[PDB]
Write a protein that binds this ligand. Structure first.
Ligand SMILES: CC(=O)N[C@@H]1[C@@H](O)[C@H](O[C@@H]2O[C@H](CO)[C@H](O)[C@H](O)[C@H]2O)[C@@H](CO)O[C@H]1O
Length: 278
């Protein structure tokens, strides 16, 4: 045991509403040199009956060196399904579970590793728990099926200074490029974020009164076809701080007065699984 703060195990959370197709559950944490295993469960129960059905049990085992999936229903477990555990005792873990109408899609380190077909109703999932040799650093459930091209207004204050736009996406395995535009009311694009795999660069520019600006590239593309990524756009005093998978990828000096950035567009060869203003 080391440090508590938030998300101490055993962690138990009652969902506000049913886990529905299109939603994702993200669990990040750290393990220790002596961690043996930890579990993640999507379980039934109305309030806290404890002992009901378990519509997806995930066991990450360091001893066995495998990630094991199973279901518990009507008082009994089914046959386990296994995949290799890419993690060594220690080092951080990143597990993501996305619900679909016929299965759960599980990713480890943002890489799809398992398609678990529903064995019992997904609607039975009313709670999720995490326990074992793990220190939880981040837990989030939400998202939906975002259609792309995508377009929407941003809150009432939009991407204002001191705030950040968080986007969870996966560039398509056979995609060439995709883009994310942060714009103003008149249609000017404050920031154009455009990953181009066929050019091995991410282009950043601004569209002002119908004309494209300079264009800032270079900085080694941190994205990869078919792998999930967490993109963060932090609106700061002098520039947008662009983070990719937790690391600052670049800075982009404001060319348009910040403030009043309440427009978002996403297009190209990409799948979007979550968008949030933090
Ligand atoms: C469909 C569309 O308008 N796409 C444009 C991109 O073509 C454009 O890329 C730049 O294009 C110019 C020529 O017009 C030149 O080739 C640059 O090297 C290239 O980066 C991009 C940036 O202006 O804006 C998109 O909207």
């Amino acid at each position: 045991m080391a440090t508590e703060t938030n998300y101490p195990v055993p962690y138990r959370s009652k969902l506000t509403e049913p886990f529905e197709p299109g939603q994702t559950l993200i669990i990040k944490g750290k393990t220790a040199e002596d961690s043996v295993r930890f579990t993640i469960n999507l379980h039934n129960t109305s309030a806290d009956f404890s002992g009901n059905d378990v519509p997806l049990h995930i066991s990450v085992r360091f001893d066995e060196g495998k990630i094991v999936f199973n279901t518990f229903s009507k008082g009994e477990w089914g046959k386990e399904e296994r995949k290799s555990n890419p993690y060594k005792k220690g080092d951080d873990i990143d597990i993501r579970i996305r619900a679909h109408d016929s299965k759960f899609s599980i990713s480890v380190d943002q890489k799809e590793v398992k398609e678990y077909e529903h064995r019992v109703p997904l609607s039975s999932v009313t709670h999720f728990s995490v326990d074992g040799d793990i220190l939880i650093t981040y837990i989030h459930w939400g998202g939906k099926y975002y259609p792309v091209p995508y377009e929407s207004g941003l809150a009432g204050d939009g991407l204002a200074p001191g705030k950040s736009l968080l986007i969870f996406a996966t560039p398509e395995k056979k995609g060439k490029r995709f883009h994310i535009n942060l714009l103003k009311k008149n249609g000017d694009i404050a920031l154009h974020f455009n990953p181009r795999f066929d050019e091995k660069a991410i282009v950043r520019n601004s569209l002002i009164s119908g004309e494209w600006g300079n264009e800032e590239r270079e900085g080694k593309n941190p994205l990869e076809k078919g792998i999930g990524c967490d993109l963060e756009f932090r609106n700061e005093e002098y520039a947008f701080q662009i983070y990719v998978d937790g690391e600052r990828f670049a800075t982009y000096a404001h060319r348009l007065d910040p403030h009043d950035i309440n427009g978002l567009q996403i297009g190209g060869d990409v799948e979007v699984t979550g968008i949030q203003m933090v």
